Amino acid sequence: FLKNEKDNALLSAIEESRKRTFVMAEEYHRESMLVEWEQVKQRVLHTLLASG
Amino acid sequence: FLVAHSDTIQAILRSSLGSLQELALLTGIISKAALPGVLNEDGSMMELQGHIGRFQRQCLALLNRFGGSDRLRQLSLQDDSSRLDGVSKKDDMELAMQQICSNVMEYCQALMIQNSPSFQQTVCLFTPSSILPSWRLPSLGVVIHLLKQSANNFFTYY
């Protein structure tokens, strides 16, 4: 059935679309936040120690 | 870029998982951006000193929405049907409180380091006891409220 075939192709397309979207978004924001936290921690600690 | 959209940035701060994630990146962008070192490199030095003071006023307004008794009503209103969305909303509710404030407070600390906690503040820091206008003066007892709030949000975040 042409209907069935086209529907399945569309479903596969929607799959690859959501996959990359999710992957990229997650990775990027996770990276940013973690980088921020690590930097903050290290800098604060070292500065406090040196000032002591 | 944060100033070029000063109408929208101040409408988000004064305003859901999506909403909480917006507050995340905004404050994650603010604290890596809202650096007064950019100011000096007066029309633009007052435009940005007004945007910074708005961020600080709006990042303290989130200590009473997430660090107060209203933290329970934001978690129960999703328990009508608390799917894996509602649990993710709360994680972004917290990633507001934790990441918005740490970011802003880290900014405050960096500012302090740059200027030796206002070295010449030998002028009495303490007394011996609205749409963005052209000019508005800030307050300094805001720092003690930020301290009393962060010391009370630490034990709830722990």
Q: Angle at CA B98, nearest 5°, toward B92 and B102?
A: 140
CB atoms within 10 A of CB B89: 22
Q: Is B128 helix (H, G, I), strand (E, B) or coil?
A: coil
Taking the CA of residue B56 and the nearest CA in chain A, the distance in Å comes to: 19
Taking the CA of residue B106 and the nearest CA in chain A, the distance in Å comes to: 7
Note the maximum CA span of chain B. Answer: 56
CB contact under 8 A, B106 and A33: no
Q: What method did the depositors use to determine the structure?
A: cryo-EM
CB contact under 8 A, A33 and B95: yes
**Does residue B11 come out as left (phi exceeding 0), alpha (psi in the -120 to 50 range) or beta?**
alpha
Name the H helices within chain A.
2-51
Using the 8-state DSSP alphabet, how is residue B115 labeled?
A: H
Question: Is A32 touching B (CB cutoff 8 A)?
Answer: yes
Residues 6+ apart with CB under 8 A from B22: B12
CB contact under 8 A, B106 and A40: yes
Determine the Cα–Cα distance for residues A18 and A1; give it in Å rounded to an integer: 26
Using the 8-state DSSP alphabet, how is residue B15 labeled?
A: -
Is the Cβ–Cβ distance between B101 and B25 less than 8 Å?
no
In B, what residues contact A, Cβ < 8 A? Answer: 24-25, 28, 31-32, 95, 99, 102-103, 106, 109, 113
Question: Is A40 touching B (CB cutoff 8 A)?
Answer: yes
Taking the CA of residue A41 and the nearest CA in chain B, the distance in Å comes to: 9
Name the H helices within B34-83.
36-39, 43-60, 63-66, 70-76
